[PDB]
Design a protein around this ligand. Sequence first.
Ligand code: DJ3
Ligand code: YB
Ligand code: YB
Ligand code: ZN
Length: 608
Amino acid sequence: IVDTCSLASPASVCRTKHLHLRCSVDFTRRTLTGTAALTVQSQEDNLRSLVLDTKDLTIEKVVINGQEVKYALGERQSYKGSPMEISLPIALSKNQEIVIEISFETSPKSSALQWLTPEQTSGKEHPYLFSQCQAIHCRAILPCQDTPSVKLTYTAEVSVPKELVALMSAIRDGETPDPEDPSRKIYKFIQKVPIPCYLIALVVGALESRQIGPRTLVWSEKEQVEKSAYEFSETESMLKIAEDLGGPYVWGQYDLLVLPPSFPYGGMENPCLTFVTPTLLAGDKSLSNVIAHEISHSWTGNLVTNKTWDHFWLNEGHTVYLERHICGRLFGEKFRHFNALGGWGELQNSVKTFGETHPFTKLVVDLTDIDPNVAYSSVPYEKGFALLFYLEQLLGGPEIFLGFLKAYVEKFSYKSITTDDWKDFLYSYFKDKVDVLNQVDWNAWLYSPGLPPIKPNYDMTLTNACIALSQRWITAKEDDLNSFNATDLKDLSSHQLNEFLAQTLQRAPLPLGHIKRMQEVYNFNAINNSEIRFRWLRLCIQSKWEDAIPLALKMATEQGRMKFTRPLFKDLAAFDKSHDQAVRTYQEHKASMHPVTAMLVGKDLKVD
Ligand SMILES: CCCCC/C=C\C\C=C/C=C/C=C/[C@@H]1O[C@H]1CCCC(=O)O
Ligand SMILES: [Yb+3]
Ligand SMILES: [Yb+3]
Ligand SMILES: [Zn+2]
């Protein structure tokens, strides 16, 4: 097992045990400067050098035993960055530990960071910075073994302009004036649980907080605090359910940070401080499954970790499985099945986009010379979930399979594992059902592209009305459109409206007159729920309604969640009437987008 996405020495050669980060955030230069002190343990005899990952980092010096040591930056290897070899002053024996202090500065173009001007924030008076290290962007902040096969503790001291606040994926450990610059404050942090370095995270900005549970504050700019406190009020109830299913919550605090609209994901499971998109702020808590998902990562992902990114499905599939159990406990088993069946539809969509033979539709994926951001899709989420849901039904039901899940978390806590470790423990836990496990087509499920070889069984109770109404619209002729009316929606929840739109979008385009009628009688243009609005606008653009062009351009640019922004830009580029404007709009906005999102939209549009 080799991590083909890292250029650093592997864990079999040496292991980082601890990071002590002292840095300063310079908004004038858009740089982070400081020192990263790595406590490294040799795993072999006579160790005289080691290699760290870096990406667009300027290295000033490397200090061991109080003296500068020799180092060399190799040539850049595309998205992987540049390897940094350090010559150790004294050969190390196996299990010997030393401290290596590296003085470094980031580049303004760091792919881990987005620097925001005051005008890009809610308050309009202060700048803002946030990080996103998953999968392999931590090396664009600091030199490290940038592989999830290594887990380390960390402490940090971050100097910032005194008007602003710093937060990290760690427990807050005090603040003080910066003695080297009275215009600044130093914020301190401690992460005492070993983590993979992709879970290191930093935000700096004009942040305020409100308590919403016994172990949860929500953080945001002042303009969003009140709405966020209401939107995420289910958090503590979800944590209690998650603890019941996964075992103890070991991280102390579970805080939430609501980022500015360019944050690229629904959430990011940064330990002690989950990051979330403001597109969750629907006003009715209806997108709270994203919080259940990030909560669940506190066990599946953050405690039990994928050893390499080839095995990412271990993180995401088990987390989606726990996510849907949390929402099933809250709202019922029929709702769990409804969301499960919706996820199968999303798997169908991903497979249909990539193509049924595409290597990125395999559950286990070989990322040799593949940028993980390019490979990312809903496949590991939903093919992984589908495998676990299938096994649940094969092995005796959800109560039995949740017993496996808790035992799995306990077995591999604080470790990094592969698909074969998972499968071996599955066969160990279910030793009395090995004959049943040997009926599984393991090669198809784990290593073949396309849809899985067997579809699970799904309760249809909550889905039937969505399918029925979608089919009424698809089979309607012009003389049937008069029969549709706002009353068609009166018994549908927001989740069901979203699924009605998903069902109909799968058959797009529809005739333009149908889409116009849908707006006339359902007024979907008025809905601000981001998931509903996204699917409605995709349906309008794919059905060639020119009126929807400005709406789709607005949504694609006024937020930056990649799930929404990328498909909206792609749909607009595919519609001949909006193509030129889509490209011009991307070019005008690209410099102020998140660096990774800008790169991907450019690839999607075939723009340079
Ligand atoms: C199995 C294919 C391997 C390729 C992917 C490898 C590494 C993934 C890189 C970045 C992942 C960021 C994930 C963020 C949170 O779980 C996502 C919840 C929000 C997603 C959304 O709803 O927009
Ligand atoms: Yb030796
Ligand atoms: Yb303390
Ligand atoms: Zn996730």
